[PDB]
Amino acid sequence: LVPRGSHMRILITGGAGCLGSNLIEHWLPQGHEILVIDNFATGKREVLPPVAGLSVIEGSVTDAGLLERAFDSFKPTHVVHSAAAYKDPDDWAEDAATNVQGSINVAKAASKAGVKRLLNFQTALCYGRPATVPIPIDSPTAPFTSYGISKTAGEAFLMMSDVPVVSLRLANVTGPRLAIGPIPTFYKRLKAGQKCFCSDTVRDFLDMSDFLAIADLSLQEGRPTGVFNVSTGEGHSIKEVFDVVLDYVGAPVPVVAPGADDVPSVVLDPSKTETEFGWKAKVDFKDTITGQLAWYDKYGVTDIFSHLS
Amino acid sequence: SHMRILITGGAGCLGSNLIEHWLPQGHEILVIDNFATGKREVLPPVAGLSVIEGSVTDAGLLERAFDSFKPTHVVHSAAAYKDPDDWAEDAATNVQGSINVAKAASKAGVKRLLNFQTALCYGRPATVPIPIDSPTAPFTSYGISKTAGEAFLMMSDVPVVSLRLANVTGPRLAIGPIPTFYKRLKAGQKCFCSDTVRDFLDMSDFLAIADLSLQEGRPTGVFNVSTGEGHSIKEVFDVVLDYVGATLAEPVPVVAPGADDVPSVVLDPSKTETEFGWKAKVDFKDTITGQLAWYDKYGVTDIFSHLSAP
Ligand SMILES: NC(=O)c1ccc[n+]([C@@H]2O[C@H](COP(=O)([O-])OP(=O)(O)OC[C@H]3O[C@@H](n4cnc5c(N)ncnc54)[C@H](O)[C@@H]3O)[C@@H](O)[C@H]2O)c1
Ligand SMILES: NC(=O)c1ccc[n+]([C@@H]2O[C@H](COP(=O)([O-])OP(=O)(O)OC[C@H]3O[C@@H](n4cnc5c(N)ncnc54)[C@H](O)[C@@H]3O)[C@@H](O)[C@H]2O)c1
């Protein structure tokens, strides 16, 4: 039915997560039909209200039968693979099961169901310790943590599908219900008058609105396929992040090593994504950090505030 | 120097040749295998040799095996590959199986774990011979699952040696171009050579580095095992042709490789020579001739055992 001529029946694995839920808040108001499959390892049941257009199956991407049944009942036109395990770095079996096996299961099921487009999200940890920053899209994958290793094989399997597949390697996405990392940590701790530390690292940050726009483009029939970096292409230090928070909150911070497994600089080159999609990120660094903080002022550092009615 | 060796995949080509090398030495060996590709005939009921039929994907069975047998040493030689569209099995055996073996070895505090790795981990290399510090870049089910598996093994607290291998020839090799040219030439069938370059390694050179890899205080990490020299399939064909004595009715066509047939896969073994002091002794001609001599005695078979059964 609606949007007229481009209604999506969208199967989102990992839909109770940060990215999934934001995507849902973006697409459900437009009239798309969404089915979520989540096991609530990190995702919250509170971000999926019983609203029209939205169905939820509590389940794993590792469960191939649950997937065949969901894909058969629902008949998606489009798939967003957003399920990832990561929370216990020593539980390699879970990471392999979710991130590799779950990806293979989503890919085989998608293929059989004849989906039009599949959208995967990749971690920049796939790049390990890069030789060239900003990291070019044709850089080698070189992970050295469980999450990086399993995610890297997951993506590589997806890229063997006959289903058209877009895999976006992402900058740290800021937006509603981000409750981990330096931004909420400095906000909370500065407001509490606690000592903060800045790792001497460079990272890149992406506003939710820019993530939403490349996600939209990625699911359009006929658009490019393959692996793509999603970023402004600009890097900012953790100290720089801390500086925006301090100023915003209204309150001499030490700058320290690079811990062992803490990659000194991670910034992605988006140029090929700009070329093939006509996409460019609009919101700059200060507006990106400030908008996350503004959200914390309204709802607090929480992952359970729903913008759905 | 007595080893209690747990060898996953011991019924296959590498596993069984290793067992025939080590069992006469008084070593104690437990084989875990599911017989997907490897054969039951290569594992006679002999003193020193135990066989558990099972999967490396079975975490229960591995835990029970490492507990009862208490290995000092692990050789992870189990791999799935036969159906390139069966990604689930490849991921199950090669990634989950490797994690299971790694965790179990770590828990049992084994001294040394030895892994074998396919040169498909390198995908399409930028430089040939392939340097050890080259990126992994697999694009097939086998290569991607194996790449992830090796990477997990590398995160173990056990000392790990992962050997990236040239094509190993020896007892019971019954796949690839060598047995295919041998069989077809003797039967008067037309052969095709793709226009590819590969490396080949005699069993005796493989046995020598495997030995070194399981010695305490030896180097750890990833290593290329090879002579470092590359030979086309056409060169392989010529050795077989000459050896077999056949007369050709037509000159063999050399055809361009498929899209997924990597044109040149030769490994640079130089860090291995530096750190182990190992060097392959058997040249190309002798490597190929040695395989064909073995075929002449036993035929192209993967069920002939060199172990004396009671
Ligand atoms: N948010 C980012 O800045 C960022 C950066 C790089 C990559 N990514 C990728 O984007 C995706 C979403 O990330 P996020 O930030 O929303 O993380 P998240 O933890 O908020 O969401 C992942 C969701 O997957 C679910 N999940 C875990 N295992 C599952 C399984 N077996 N079956 C079904 N669901 C399962 C969790 O319950 C969770 O809701 C992940 O794949 C992640 O690797 C995100
Ligand atoms: N032969 C070579 O030149 C070569 C080259 C590169 C890499 N390797 C690697 O060396 C190892 C041995 O190779 P091979 O040449 O002996 O192949 P092979 O097929 O003869 O043996 C693999 C063995 O593993 C067994 N197996 C498969 N799945 C299993 C599982 N779930 N649990 C337990 N056993 C399982 C098979 O039955 C088989 O006996 C593999 O890891 C392979 O990737 C070999």
Residue numbers in the entry:
A (entry chain B): -6 to 244, 249 to 306
B (entry chain A): -1 to 308
Task: Please give sentences taken from the publication describing this entry.
The wbm locus contains three neighbouring SDR genes (wbmF, wbmG and wbmH), all of which have been annotated as nucleotide-sugar epimerases/dehydratases. WbmF, WbmG and WbmH are all homologous to Pfam01370 (NAD-dependent epimerase/dehydratase family). The abrogation or reduction of O-antigen expression as a result of wbmF, wbmG or wbmH mutations implicates all three genes in the biosynthesis of this molecule, and is consistent with the hypothesis that these three adjacent SDR genes catalyse the UDP-d-ManNAc3NAcA to UDP-l-GalNAc3NAcA conversion, which is probably required for O-antigen synthesis.
Soaking and co-crystallisation experiments with His6-WbmF and His6-WbmG revealed the binding mode for the nucleotide portion of the sugar nucleotide substrates of these enzymes. The X-ray data from a His6-WbmG crystal soaked with UDP-glucose revealed extra density that could be modelled as far as the α-phosphate. The location of this molecule is consistent with the nucleotide-binding site for SDR homologue structures and with the hydrogen-bonding chemistry expected to bind uridine. No density was visible corresponding to the hexose portion of the soaked compound nor the second phosphate, suggesting that either this portion of the molecule is disordered within the crystal, or the compound was partially hydrolysed and the smaller uridine monophosphate (UMP) preferentially soaked into the substrate-binding pocket. In either case, the data indicate that the glucose-1-phosphate moiety of UDP-glucose is not strongly bound in a single conformation by WbmG. In both structures the β-phosphate is coordinated by a conserved arginine, although the precise location of this phosphate is different in the two structures and both are inconsistent with the β-phosphate positions of bound substrate in the structure of a D128N, E129Q mutant of dTDP-glucose 4,6-dehydratase, DesIV, from S. venezuelae. Unusually, in WbmG the pi-stacking residue (Phe190) is the one that hydrogen bonds with the uracil N-3. S. venezuelae DesIV,23 and Pseudomonas aeruginosa WbpP,25 the hydrophobic contact is provided by the residue in the n + 2 position, whose backbone amide hydrogen bonds with the base's O2 group. This unusual feature of the substrate binding in WbmG could not have been predicted from sequence alignments alone.
